[PDB]
Amino acid sequence: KLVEQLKMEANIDRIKVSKAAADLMAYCEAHAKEDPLLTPVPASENPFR
Amino acid sequence: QRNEEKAQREANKKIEKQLQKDKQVYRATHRLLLLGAGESGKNTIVKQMRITSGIFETKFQVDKVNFHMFDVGAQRDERRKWIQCFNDVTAIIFVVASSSYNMTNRLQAALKLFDSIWNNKWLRDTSVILFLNKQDLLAEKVLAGKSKIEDYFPEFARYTRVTRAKYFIRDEFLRISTASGDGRHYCYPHFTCAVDTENIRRVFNDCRDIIQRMHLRQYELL
Amino acid sequence: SYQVITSLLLGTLIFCAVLGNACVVAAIALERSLQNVANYLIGSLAVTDLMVSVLVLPMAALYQVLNKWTLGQVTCDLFIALDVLCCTSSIWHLCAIALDRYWAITDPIDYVNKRTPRRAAALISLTWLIGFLISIPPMLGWRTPEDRSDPDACTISKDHGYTIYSTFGAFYIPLLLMLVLYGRIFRAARFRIRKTVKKVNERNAEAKRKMALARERKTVKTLGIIMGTFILCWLPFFIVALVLPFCESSCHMPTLLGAIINWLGYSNSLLNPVIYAYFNKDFQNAFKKII
Amino acid sequence: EAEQLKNQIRDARKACADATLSQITNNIDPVGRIQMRTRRTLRGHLAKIYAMHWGTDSRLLVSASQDGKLIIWDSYTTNKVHAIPLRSSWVMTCAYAPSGNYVACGGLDNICSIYNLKTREGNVRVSRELAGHTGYLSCCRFLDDNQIVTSSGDTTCALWDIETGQQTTTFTGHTGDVMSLSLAPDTRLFVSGACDASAKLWDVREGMCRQTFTGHESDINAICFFPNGNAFATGSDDATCRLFDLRADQELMTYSHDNIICGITSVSFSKSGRLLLAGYDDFNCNVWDALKADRAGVLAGHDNRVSCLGVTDDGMAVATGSWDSFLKIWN
Ligand SMILES: CC(C)CCC[C@@H](C)[C@H]1CC[C@H]2[C@@H]3CC=C4C[C@@H](O)CC[C@]4(C)[C@H]3CC[C@]12C
Ligand SMILES: Cc1ccc(CNCC2(F)CCN(C(=O)c3ccc(F)c(Cl)c3)CC2)nc1
């Protein structure tokens, strides 16, 4: 019935989870230099005191 | 520099003043939650106490005590994960039609609903103002000779006609609060037909009683 | 030295009282869970007992140990007035607490509508006005300072009118006032426990009877603890301070039996937070937050 | 046919699992424990805090409480910009418009209430009322000043045109009520969490479910997108948090801890995405290393259950809202 149109997601192109892990860790490694939470920023540039 | 922040600070002071005033007004206002199916005597109680959304607010005052009333049956489904918003209420007005077991085993559903709501973790420290509305229809059905409450309370034969039958419905609702043994609150019905004027007076007396118990437990004279 | 076995005990008692009052006055201010009118009254009682423990208690110990009054020529009286002020304020705080409990229990509608913290502030003002009215008349002499001149000692004032006025205002009127208040809110509680049985199986009927009996026992135990503390601490001092001044012809009272009476009266400041604050469930759970 | 068509999806999902996230992120050593501490505290509200949202501008903040008050803070210097009177005191949701002009809230009143802060007379007044839902409103997010996507307890997500006030698009793919809803950074897709233990990726432009994720074992209470947009993180009552990827329909990482037996209330991501902060029932918020499941450290600081989490657009600060009527700002 309508579940047929709910289950039409069987045609999606699931790319390899290897590339998913790879570009996820690449995003984390590339953006770790601009994350104030990951490494505490100096109190000079911190707006919260 | 300083000029643009003094205005923000005084706006903060005014906002804090209004918030504190609103809390002070609210604290002198009572909290009550209603439960029970639509087949119960809920409509009569609400119609008396009034004089699309899942919450309807009926507010009033009796004997200089402000009441805020929340019927919550209009919330369609899944009471499980939003009932924590009502743990601060003083008491629950649980309305059950005592005459409605014949009219499916609806009274067993009322039993299980009462058992679920009394042993609720959020409402273990809250009283229950029970109701057993339209007792007159119960008397009419019992006097018919067939619609006795033993059909859906198969343990009636030991209890001690209309008064005898009505109190067993009262007492087996009390088993939920008594066998659990909360030790802080107690349950109490009030037989009402559709035209009794003492419902709001009974609720007011009950709220006064609950406040007295709270005071006697705070200073631990109870 | 003989002072050592006395100074050690007295200093330990004063330090324990200081800690007991300081914990309460800090825990009420730090936590907003305990910030209510009744606990505001209990906190005012705690700060009054702290004032007793840090102002008049250590010096009183200093006078007792040295046996002589040498800290000042005539400065004894000012201290006694402080002593009288703080002690009668601590006594009348119990009456204020009893009156607040009576008004809350008997009249719930008044509680809901008009039990503001302004009520606690007015009660504290009126409980310190009693000290202002009691400690001051002997400062200028009750009628005229003519007989209590003794540089070597520091004792309570014996003036003919004052030995009646002070002993009745500070203790006896509060004693019967608390008696009638905690009798009224005793029979009210007993009537309510009886109502919960009259208006309402073994696990049903016996449970009702046993919890009603337990509630009756529980309230009589609470009233017994409060009244026993008040009586056992203050009564001997305020019966000695009235019997003896009228029989100065044969005023004999052994020091080993009379000096203990002064300090039993004092120990009310230590024992007040033990029953009013420490044993209370709210503080019993709030003190867990500090570790 | 569709009752067994999920077999092909499951087979492809299992066969696509070639390299697990936990099997490859070992090229980076753990970042180490974080020393997060509270910088500001907020005490204006006087009842349980149920929701909170950060503006795109880093300055302001919004919080909704069950006392009938919606307030707008000032994070840098603790202050009140606006505190408005509500027409219903049963709100469990709030959202701040990216443009900085609108704020919305909703709850048990089955209604999305939208408040305009840029009134010509200055006073904040309600602008529109979105009452089409038949279940308690549980999540709300803004797309623009005339576009909004709403979650509710009627087992249906909705899309509302504020100008017309109509449910322009409806998402009926779920089988239970939905409580969490966050938009992708490219605001053309979004995901929703539900109590049927599933998360569904919604295609806004066609109004149809695209991918269904079935990792959690209980009711999902929180969901939020990875900053990239190709992934998102969830939070459920199973005392576990899970990370899902759109392009690879498996679960990349599962976050769990021995000292955790309580459900997750809110989740959010930092600017880089490596730090995932989740608020729990147990009074505190944990911080997780998203690539090795290492809990860097807890926040605590709340004497009642924390109900909402939010990381600033610049990622500088973390705000937490709890039922103790207190908001704490972390850094
Ligand atoms: C149970 C104890 C620890 C506290 C309660 C009892 C109090 C009132 C007792 C215990 C120790 C007692 C003191 C012990 C020693 C002396 C020296 C002597 O000149 C008698 C008075 C004096 C100064 C006593 C006064 C009363 C006293 C303080
Ligand atoms: C009205 C009243 C009077 C007295 C009291 C209790 N008062 C305790 C005393 F019995 C302690 C000793 N008394 C002193 O006056 C004193 C002597 C030496 C001192 F070093 C100090 Cl500090 C005080 C007399 C009062 N309640 C109410």
Numbering used by the authors:
A (entry chain G): 14 to 62
B (entry chain A): 12 to 62, 204 to 255, 263 to 319, 333 to 394
C (entry chain R): 34 to 233, 325 to 415
D (entry chain B): 10 to 340
Sentences reproduced from the published study:
Of interest in this approach is the serotonin 5-HT1A receptor (5-HT1AR), which is a Gαi/o-coupled receptor belonging to the family of serotonin receptors that comprises in total 12 heterotrimeric GTP-binding protein (G protein)–coupled receptors (GPCRs) and one ion channel (5-HT3R). Cryo–electron microscopy structures of ST171 bound to 5-HT1AR in complex with the Gi protein compared to the canonical agonist befiradol bound to complexes of 5-HT1AR with Gi or Gs revealed that the ligands occupy different exo-sites. We observed several differences at the extracellular portions and in the binding poses of befiradol and ST171 in the 5-HT1AR-Gi complexes, which may explain their distinct signaling signatures. Both agonists show a bitopic binding mode occupying the conserved orthosteric pocket but addressing distinct allosteric sites of the 5-HT1AR.
In addition, we solved a structure of befiradol engaging the 5-HT1AR in complex with the Gs protein at a nominal resolution of 3.2 Å. The complex of befiradol with 5-HT1AR and the Gs protein revealed minor changes at the macromolecular and microswitch level, leading to similar orientations of the toggle switch residue W3586.48, the PIF and NPxxY motifs, and the break of the ionic lock. Again, the methyl pyridinyl-substituted aminomethyl moiety of befiradol engages residues V1173.33, I1674.56, I18945.52, A2035.46, F3616.51, F3626.52, and A3656.55 in the orthosteric pocket through hydrophobic interactions. At the extracellular side, the comparison of the befiradol-bound 5-HT1AR-Gi and 5-HT1AR-Gs complexes revealed a 1.8-Å outward movement of TM7, leading to a rearrangement of ECL3 and an increased distance between the carbonyl group of Q972.65 and the indole nitrogen of W3586.48.
